[PDB]
Structure formats: structure tokens, C-alpha cells
Design a binder for this molecule. Structure first.
Ligand code: I4A
Length: 131
């Protein structure tokens, strides 16, 4: 996937605190992650895609090949099994841990990168625009 490539700034966000709470993120991390306005800087080299998320709270990064499950350490220190695929132009990320699942989709919409987060019955939408 490549139409996702470049540098994106979070401009809006709904229900993220609720989403985090449902994922199991403790209050202090929720406070600082919720308040953060991370840049998401996505790039691609052959079959390896790299997504960086940068903010004063925390800098993270994942590198991966579509369809190949990998170990991820999240910003909220979960140790999850991750599996990112391309499906009808949406990058679908799945995290499994403790028999739990959450799914994160990134899609390109007009000039936005739209990220939809889902845990159990809680859904969250965040929007990022080019830097
Ligand atoms: N400070 C930062 O770098 C930062 C802040 C908020 C979210 C994120 C990334 N992120 C994270 C989660 C998540 C779910 C859907 C979309 C994003 C995103 O905007 O990339 C998410 C799980 C909760 C723990 C925080 C990491 C990063």
C-alpha cells in the first residue's frame, strides 16, 4: 500500500478516551495519549511498510509486511499479535492479546487519512490531514 504514504497530523478525534478505556488502558496513560496530537508518518520500501507515530507523550513505530503476523509493543505497553492487511483500499490492523481483539482501519478519504478504532462495542474515529 502506498496512497497512505507521507506525513499526517491528527486534526479531530471522537470517543478515543472511551475506546482506550475499553481496551484496558489505565487513566494516566489515557490522559496523556488522549491529549496528544501525534504525527503519523507512513512510508513504504518494497514489501515493508513502516508507520511512525510521534508526539511529546511517546514516539512509536512499526514495520511490517502485509499479511505476516508480528509482535507489537503498543504505546500503552500491551504486547500484542498484530496482523495488517490491505482490503478494498483500507489498511486493516488487527491486534490479538489474551484472547482479546481490537481492530484499527486507516482509509484515505478526500484529503484525509481516517482511522476507525474498534473494541467490543466501542467505536472511535480519528482524522489526520497532511502536514
Ligand atoms: N502520542 C502518540 O504517539 C499517540 C497518541 C494517541 C494515539 C496513538 C496511536 N494509537 C494508539 C492506540 C490507537 C488506536 C487507534 C488509532 C491510533 C492512532 O491514532 O494511530 C492509536 C491504542 C491505545 C494506546 C495508544 C496508541 C499515538
Amino acid at each position: 500500500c502506498d496512497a497512505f504514504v507521507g506525513t499526517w497530523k491528527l486534526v479531530s478525534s471522537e470517543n478515543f478516551d472511551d475506546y482506550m478505556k475499553e481496551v484496558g488502558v489505565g487513566f494516566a496513560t489515557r490522559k496523556v495519549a488522549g491529549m496528544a496530537k501525534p504525527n503519523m508518518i507512513i512510508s513504504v520500501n518494497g514489501d515493508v511498510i513502516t508507520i511512525k507515530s510521534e508526539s511529546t507523550f511517546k514516539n512509536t513505530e512499526i514495520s511490517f509486511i502485509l499479511g505476516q503476523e508480528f509482535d507489537e509493543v503498543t504505546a500503552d505497553d500491551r504486547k500484542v499479535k498484530s496482523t495488517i492487511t490491505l482490503d478494498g483500499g483500507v489498511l486493516v490492523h488487527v491486534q490479538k492479546w489474551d484472547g482479546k481483539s481490537t481492530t484499527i482501519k486507516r482509509k484515505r478519504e478526500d484529503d484525509k487519512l481516517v482511522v476507525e478504532c474498534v473494541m467490543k462495542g466501542v467505536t472511535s474515529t480519528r482524522v489526520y490531514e497532511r502536514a
